[PDB]
Design a protein around this nucleic acid. Structure first.
Ligand SMILES: [Mg+2]
Ligand SMILES: [Mg+2]
Ligand SMILES: [Mg+2]
Ligand SMILES: [Mg+2]
Ligand SMILES: [Mg+2]
Lengths: 145, 71, 140, 103, 313, 211, 183
RNA sequence: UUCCGUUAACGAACGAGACCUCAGCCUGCUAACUAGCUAUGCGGAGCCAUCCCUCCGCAGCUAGCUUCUUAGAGGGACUAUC
């Protein structure tokens, strides 16, 4: 009851707009890949630090015993990175909750929360439908007199 | 603007008027008994009646109200 | 180091290394229309890189490595982009099919990519080996 | 039993289609036949958008009409006899039942 | 003879609904909350209160997040590796505390489940719901006889005596009913409450049965004879009732304070009250009382999600 | 032979919309209320709801067989693959099409409009509708056209419950001076058995059980 | 020093001089330290929530102009990085301190509404500072060989010193003057 | 014309809101050979062989499962708490 369980597997997803990234975590040696390629290669490159933020904050030492395989689909080139971000963060939090004690989870979750709640909670913002009478959701056709 | 309409307010005072005894100070308990002493046609309208019922049920404890609450 | 496959290396560097590999191998025969054609009709100039043929060969070799079953129309869509229509709105356009077919046939005449019965082109074991053994030489 | 039966159900209404599907999967589970389903296909949204004005005057206002087609697939393993004995109950109007025998 | 504020633990962010304790004095506890989760507490190294404003009488060890709505009652197994948590989503889950996953879902209740109870031998399971029915189960998720009341059956405790297995039942119909498990019929309707019976409790010897709720008066009856007895009067609505394991006490979690009553003198020995500092939490009361197996520590679940421990000194 | 599931549901809808039009034009003075298509495995049974169910049947069912054969050939059914029944509209007062046609013939004859519209209102309210409304638009008396509303009872106009509680029809009278319009809106009462009206109570309606 | 802008520049040693403009530049608190000037944050739901947005991000968002550059925030972040490197090259100091000094020495403090001279609130002060800085950099870059990053670096460096060679400072001076003439 | 409050008005009704649809949440439920995941087996490549590890392909209605996809049922917010 008060003993750590045998390290196993968790699968966690993150979302931004219509992009979904799902991280499969298994006991390993600290490998992190997205769609087969290593995360240290994710693009755009100037949003690479955004996806590295959960690792840079939880520390690369907290990822030694897990291998992170992430599949991301949908969205665009920014929302996919923001989805991979949240998938990594939520996957580490869930892995520490089932196989690494609740306290350590609480600490890593507190770090993630103080940095950004988007790391753990998805932004609920979606495109607003277009209305007839304009070319956009709010924009209306130019009026003459 | 979160102003409750008459249907929510009227139902709240009628529920407290009859079933004051089986009405607690908690929204989640009040919305369960509201399903047992009433037939409301929406979850959204049932929640608004129980949230205003809880609101009134706490002002009764304060002491002044314009219902009846004979007690 | 080595033991790095294609899905371990930066694509911009892998394509540049494999184009040099292909040019060194000397098993690529270039058409007469290499310095004339455009890669697509929406293009307004021929490719500015003299080794663009080998660069495109490396690009399609890598694409066939990562995916199986790409046809000539699929590669026309892959290398197609935005067409600017003068005073009219831009739209998507497809690439040239002759270039894709000729380069893929040149890559069949090396045992790098074969053609699958299910349609398109597959990567051969020799082609997989070649791309994987070049990926290990790519500096990290 | 022996063969493989795919019953496709389509409708414009969710409740009638779902209760027909429930009847089918309940009958299948009473006769001890294994049933894979109901499997809900993505809903088809037939959309028509037209100018409400019968002429060309006024604010160009558009009404968007929708017809939603809901498709359900049930996969039993059995013989044709039990399949037509099951799909003989009162199928509600609007529900299009379709039985196809596979290998 | 008295209790002191040993410490406080915060692991739930919303009203703690139940606290189960191991029967074998294992150094953990299990607590449920309205945050839809169970929590096992590491109670091996308890940091006693230093008034230095920090520490945690216990560490949250393992969370159990399988239920879909408010978890309301959890009872531990006799072995201690298994937990049974009733939830408002209508099901009962059996959790392996070592692993942390559900081993059996108990479907059959249409409304929110309010009270669960393991038998003395962990063979039968009884649940109480808002459907006004008492359902008997097996450890294989099969529903036996489905016992009647005319309101929310709020509590159902297994009589700890074996001559005739008995399940009590307190309901929002303002009644207490004694059901014979052997025939799953009824024996005695213990009536006399002036409000919903939100809590019942049975003495360890299986003779005295406590009952409280909206009326604010705790009527202690005798199960064997089904006759009313002294009528201990609490301050406000009683949320929980529990008998001291070895000290012949009766603690009642009321909305004013936690009051312990010696049933010999029928007098109030103590009244524990949180040390909250402001009128912020205008209502911060105790919802679930829980004596440890030895009877030396009292665990109290409050409406803020905190748990306060009071050890006998 | 293979028809899409889209083309098929659009075809069933168009077939329903055309059948009802030809029945409206044919069984006009028979009190035709509506048609209920029912595609059974053996045949596509077609139920006709009318008020003069002896005028649509015809002498020894000649008219109904004529319609059954016309539908079979026109719509291209297999022979004996369509059978037109003819049932009784249960409550004519609670049907806006029946009352619209009744008010049509009550005005084609020559009766004063202000006396036939109130008669329609009377019959509807005795039938049991929670509210009824009649609109008569056209060259009623003078050359300039005006619209006379005849409302009595409780009638909702907005929201979703309208398309559950409001039974409405729109019919023309082809008079000597021009066309006269008839809008009949009948508001139904909540029927727990779902026969006289909707089974779902109005959303704003709240019932408190007495203690 | 775990969180650094672009993992290359420290936040701890940034001194926001003005006490007035302290709660409306989000640089000092550890909660406002970010790796990247890109957050996709919802800093517009409430009236005073854009004040709790990192100041480098607020500078970055003003580069997405005009319409031809609208929505192109990755290019704006690239401009910010290439500007912050030129700033470090030409000043040898922390570029975040140069940026906060420029935003401090650029926000007008008094204006003339209606023509009574009114004083500017801290939030409008920082908004005006950022708007003037990026507007001057953009107008310097337009139809010019000089890159928008170099023009932004020069404008920020001249605004940090207080020199009247920066479009923002010249314009701050005009604005406050008209509120001295029309006092 | 949403309520409160004042009051020769009180009590209602339409309209507004309620309602309906789409979107947002659910590691709970129901279920997938026209959706996937994970594992296993085999094969290919790498590393150098094999093994391991990594990236792939194929197969298994006796490989499990439903996180991701779908679509039904429900839950969920009430300004609830300060
Ligand atoms: Mg072709
Ligand atoms: Mg353009
Ligand atoms: Mg409305
Ligand atoms: Mg320039
Ligand atoms: Mg799912």
């Amino acid at each position: 009851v008060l003993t750590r369980p045998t390290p196993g597997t968790v699968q966690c997803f993150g979302r931004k707009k219509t992009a979904v990234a799902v991280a499969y975590c298994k006991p390993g040696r600290g490998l992190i890949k997205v769609n087969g390629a290593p995360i240290e290669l994710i693009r755009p490159e100037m949003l690479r630090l955004k996806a590295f933020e959960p690792i840079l904050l939880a520390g690369r030492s907290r990822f030694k015993d897990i291998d992170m395989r992430i599949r991301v689909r949908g969205g665009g080139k920014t929302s996919q990175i923001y989805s991979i971000r949240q998938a990594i963060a939520k996957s580490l939090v869930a892995y520490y909750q089932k196989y690494v004690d609740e306290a350590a989870k609480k600490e890593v979750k507190e770090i993630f929360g103080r940095y950004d709640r988007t790391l753990l909670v998805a932004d609920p913002r979606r495109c607003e439908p277009k209305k007839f009478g304009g070319r956009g959701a709010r924009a209306r056709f130019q009026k003459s007199y | 603007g979160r102003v409750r309409t008459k249907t929510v307010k009227k139902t709240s005072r009628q529920v407290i008027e009859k079933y004051y005894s089986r009405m607690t100070l908690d929204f989640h308990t009040n919305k369960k008994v509201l399903e047992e002493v009433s037939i409301l046609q929406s979850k959204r309208l049932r929640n608004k009646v129980a949230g205003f019922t809880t609101h009134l049920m706490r002002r009764i404890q304060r002491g002044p109200v314009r219902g009846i609450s004979l007690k | 180091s080595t033991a790095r496959t294609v899905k371990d290396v930066n694509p911009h560097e892998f394509v540049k290394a494999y184009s040099a590999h292909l040019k060194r191998s000397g098993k690529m025969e270039l058409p007469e229309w290499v310095d004339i054609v455009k890669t697509a009709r929406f293009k307004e100039l021929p490719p500015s890189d003299a080794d663009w043929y080998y660069i495109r060969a490396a690009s399609m070799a890598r694409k066939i490595y990562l995916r199986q079953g790409i046809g000539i129309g699929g590669f026309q869509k892959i290398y197609g982009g935005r067409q600017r229509n003068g005073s009219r709105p831009p739209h998507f356009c497809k690439s040239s099919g002759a270039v894709s077919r000729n380069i893929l046939q040149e890559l069949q005449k090396m045992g790098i990519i074969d053609v699958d019965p299910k349609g398109g082109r597959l990567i051969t074991s020799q082609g997989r080996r070649d791309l994987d053994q070049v990926a290990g030489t790519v500096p990290a | 039993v022996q063969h493989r039966i795919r019953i496709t159900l389509s409708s414009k209404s969710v409740k009638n289609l779902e209760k027909v599907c429930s009847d089918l999967v309940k009958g299948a589970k009473e006769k001890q036949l294994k049933v894979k389903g109901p499997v809900r296909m993505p809903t088809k949204v037939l959309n028509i958008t037209t100018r409400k004005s019968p002429c060309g005057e006024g604010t160009n206002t558009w009404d968007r009409f929708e017809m939603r087609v809901h498709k359900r697939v049930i996969d039993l393993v059995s013989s044709p006899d039990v399949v037509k004995q099951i799909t003989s109950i009162t199928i509600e109007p609007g529900v299009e039942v379709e039985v196809t025998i596979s290998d | 003879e008295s209790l002191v504020y040993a410490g406080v633990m915060r692991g739930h962010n919303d009203v703690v609904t139940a606290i189960a304790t191991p029967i074998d004095n294992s150094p953990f506890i299990v607590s449920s909350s309205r945050d839809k989760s169970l929590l096992v507490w590491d109670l091996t190294n308890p940091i006693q209160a230093t008034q230095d404003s920090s520490s945690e009488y216990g560490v949250p060890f393992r969370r159990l997040t399988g239920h879909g709505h408010f978890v309301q009652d959890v009872v531990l197994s006799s072995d201690g590796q298994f937990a049974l948590s009733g939830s408002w989503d209508g099901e009962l889950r059996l959790w392996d505390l070592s692993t942390g996953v559900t081993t059996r879902r108990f479907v059959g209740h249409e409304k929110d489940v309010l009270s669960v109870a393991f038998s003395i031998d962990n063979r039968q399971i009884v649940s109480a719901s808002r459907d006004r029915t008492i359902k008997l189960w097996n450890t294989l998720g099969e529903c036996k006889y489905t016992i009647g009341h005319t309101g929310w059956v709020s509590c159902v405790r297994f009589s700890p005596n074996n001559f005739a297995p008995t399940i009590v039942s307190g309901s929002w119909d303002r009644s207490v009913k004694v059901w014979n498990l052997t025939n799953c019929k009824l024996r005695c309707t213990l009536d006399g409450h002036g409000g919903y019976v939100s809590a019942v409790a049975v003495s360890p010897d299986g003779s005295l049965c406590a009952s409280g709720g909206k009326d604010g008066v705790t009527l202690l009856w005798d199960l064997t004879e089904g006759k009313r007895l002294y009528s201990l009067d609490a301050g406000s609505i009683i949320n929980s009732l529990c008998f001291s394991p070895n000290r012949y006490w009766l603690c009642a979690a009321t909305q004013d304070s936690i009051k312990i009553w010696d049933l010999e003198s029928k007098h109030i020995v103590q009244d524990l009250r949180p040390e909250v500092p402001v009128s912020t939490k205008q209502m911060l009361y105790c919802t679930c009382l829980s004596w440890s197996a030895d009877g030396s520590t009292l665990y109290a679940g409050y409406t803020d999600g905190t748990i306060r421990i009071y050890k006998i000194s | 032979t293979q028809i899409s599931k889209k083309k098929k549901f659009v075809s069933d809808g168009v077939f329903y919309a055309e059948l009802n039009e030809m029945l409206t034009r044919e069984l006009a003075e028979d009190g035709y209320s509506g048609v209920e298509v029912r595609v059974t495995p053996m045949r596509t049974e077609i139920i006709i709801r009318a008020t003069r169910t002896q005028n649509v049947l015809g002498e020894k069912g000649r008219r109904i067989r004529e319609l059954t054969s016309v539908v079979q050939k026109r719509f291209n059914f297999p022979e004996n693959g369509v059978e037109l029944y003819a049932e009784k509209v249960v409550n004519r007062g609670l049907c806006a099409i029946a009352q619209a046609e009744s008010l049509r013939y009550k005005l084609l004859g020559g009766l004063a409009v202000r006396r036939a519209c109130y008669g329609v209102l009377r019959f509807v309210m005795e039938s049991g509708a929670k509210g009824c409304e009649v609109i008569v638009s056209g060259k009623l008396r003078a050359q300039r056209a005006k619209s006379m509303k005849f409302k009595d009872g409780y009638m909702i106009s907005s929201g979703q419950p309208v398309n559950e509680y409001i039974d409405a029809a729109v019919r023309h009278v082809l008079l000597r001076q021009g066309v006269l319009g008839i809008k009949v809106k009948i508001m139904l009462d909540w029927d727990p058995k779902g026969k006289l009206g909707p089974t779902t109570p109005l959303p704003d309606l709240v019932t408190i059980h007495p203690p | 020093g775990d969180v650094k802008l672009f993992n290359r520049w420290t936040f701890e040693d940034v001194q926001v001089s003005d006490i007035s403009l302290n709660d409306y530049l989000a640089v000092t608190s550890m909660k406002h330290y970010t790796f990247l000037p890109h957050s996709a944050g919802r800093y517009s739901a409430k009236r005073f929530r854009k004040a709790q947005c990192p100041i480098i991000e607020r500078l970055t968002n003003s580069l997405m102009m005009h319409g031809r550059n609208n929505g192109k925030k990755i290019m704006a972040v690239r401009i910010i990085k290439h500007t912050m490197e030129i700033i470090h090259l030409l000043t040898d100091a922390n570029p975040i301190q140069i940026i906060v000094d420029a935003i401090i020495n650029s926000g007008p403090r008094e204006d003339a509404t209606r023509r009574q001279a009114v004083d500017i609130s801290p939030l409008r002060r920082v908004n005006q500072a950022i708007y003037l800085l990026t507007t001057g950099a953009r107008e310097s870059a337009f139809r010019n060989v000089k890159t928008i990053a170099e023009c932004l670096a020069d404008e920020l460096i001249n605004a940090a010193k207080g020199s009247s060679n920066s479009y923002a400072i010249k314009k701050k001076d005009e604005i406050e003057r008209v509120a001295k003439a029309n006092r």
